[PDB]
Design a protein around this ligand. Structure first.
Ligand SMILES: CCCCCCCCCCCCO[C@@H]1O[C@H](CO)[C@@H](O[C@H]2O[C@H](CO)[C@@H](O)[C@H](O)[C@H]2O)[C@H](O)[C@H]1O
Ligand SMILES: CCCCCCCCCCCCO[C@@H]1O[C@H](CO)[C@@H](O[C@H]2O[C@H](CO)[C@@H](O)[C@H](O)[C@H]2O)[C@H](O)[C@H]1O
Ligand SMILES: CCCCCCCCCCCCO[C@@H]1O[C@H](CO)[C@@H](O[C@H]2O[C@H](CO)[C@@H](O)[C@H](O)[C@H]2O)[C@H](O)[C@H]1O
Ligand SMILES: CCCCCCCCCCCCO[C@@H]1O[C@H](CO)[C@@H](O[C@H]2O[C@H](CO)[C@@H](O)[C@H](O)[C@H]2O)[C@H](O)[C@H]1O
Ligand SMILES: CCCCCCCCCCCCO[C@@H]1O[C@H](CO)[C@@H](O[C@H]2O[C@H](CO)[C@@H](O)[C@H](O)[C@H]2O)[C@H](O)[C@H]1O
Lengths: 25, 25, 25, 25, 25, 25, 25, 25
């Protein structure tokens, strides 16, 4: 359960960062 | 470069959490 | 959409923090 | 106090994000 | 500079977890 | 176990950030 | 101590935002 | 405006944290 929650958190962050990266591309 | 670094780090963390979730199962 | 995703993330975090706070209550 | 502060911080972030999501309509 | 700041945050998190671990010991 | 796992993960993150700080220099 | 740590994080955030704002100026 | 708004919010957060640090002392 803790691992799954961490994964969800990390995926949220990765998606947010990807949006920013695309805006700078 | 900031956004790319965040994205890479976050993806790594997501993969590590996913692997832990699978191992814990 | 970015604000909506942030709201969902923050609610998830709040739910997890509240469960931890209730365990300590 | 740590868990209660975390819960308050997450709730503040959720309220801030919700207000932004409504404004951005 | 970003790596230095990230390192301090991670060290902070490590010490916070250590304090909890010691209380649980 | 939850505190110990968090401590271990944070130390790993700290080491990774340190390595990046050194590499960037 | 937690307030002090939070203050350092907030100051870091402020300076990072200032960096971006100056570049956009 | 986005960077400027983030800078203002972070400064507000830093001031709030500083006040808490001084009060806790
Ligand atoms: C906050 C969550 C972030 C945790 C990040 C952990 C990164 O751990 C490190 O990450 C970088 C990606 O940038 C990897 O790549 C390295 O091989 C790894 O040592
Ligand atoms: C702000 C600090 C946040 C707290 C820590 C942030 C999360 C970062 C942790 C991801 C580390 C990867 O987690 C994994 O750990 C095991 C054992 O430690 C390592 O071995 C793996 O190489 C690494 O992939
Ligand atoms: C309310 C929480 C708000 C957290 C906000 C985000 C993080 C802010 C970090 C502020 C600066 C932290 O400053 C950092 O503190 C940690 C914990 O004492 C110290 O780290 C200390 O513990 C770590 C972990 O065992 C050791 O690896 C290290 O050798 C030791 O000095 C760092 O040397 C210091 O640079
Ligand atoms: C890759 C990003 C990772 C971020 C991780 C989470 C935050 C970690 C914070 C680590 C410690 C930061 O250390 C903090 O740095 C900021 C930015 O230079 C400094 O703050 C500086 O800018 C602020 C904002 O204008 C001024 O109010 C302050 O007078 C000035 O000193 C703080 O005096 C220092 O205590
Ligand atoms: C892109 C990231 C932006 C970071 C913002 C995330 C946290 C949400 C903070 C929103 C609240 C702003 O906090 C602040 O409120 C007080 C109330 O008058 C104002 O004063 C400040 O000028 C305003 O900046």
């Amino acid at each position: 359960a803790x691992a799954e929650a961490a994964e969800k958190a990390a995926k949220y962050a990765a998606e947010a960062a990807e949006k920013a990266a695309k805006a700078x591309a």
